[PDB]
Design a protein around this nucleic acid. Structure first.
Length: 94
DNA sequence: CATCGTACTGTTACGGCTCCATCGATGGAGCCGTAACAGCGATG
């Protein structure tokens, strides 16, 4: 990670560059889901636990509920899935 | 010295697409030259 910064002494600006690790992201998402799923969860974290995450109210209110017999268009459900940052990929299924 | 931050920019291999340069011969018919073949009369 190289956060953007500006140095007035040299009048030079550095652009932001980052790389994402898949395993750590999956572990973080699993921890976040387990927090809302079960109460008997133990989380081992670094000082990263004090950095800005999303709103828990938005996380709870944006859960999609589906049951048999409920009328709903397939396109509407696909749009709802896309709106919660789900990527459609028939080749790379992860 | 380790820790943290809401999917980052620039330059190279490699496969697929497209444009451009560069590169007589054989059989049939007619002709010439050469060889080959066919085709009144008088007397005893």
């Amino acid at each position: 990670y190289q956060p953007e910064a500006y140095i007035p002494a040299t009048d030079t600006y550095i652009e932001k560059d980052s790389s994402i690790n898949d395993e750590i992201d999956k572990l973080r998402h699993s921890a976040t889901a387990a927090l809302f799923e079960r109460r008997d969860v133990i989380i081992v974290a670094s000082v990263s636990c004090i950095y800005g995450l999303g709103d828990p109210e938005d996380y709870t209110d944006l859960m999609l509920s589906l049951r048999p017999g409920m009328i709903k268009d397939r396109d509407e459900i696909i749009r709802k899935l896309v709106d919660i940052q789900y990527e459609r990929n028939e080749i790379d299924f992860k």
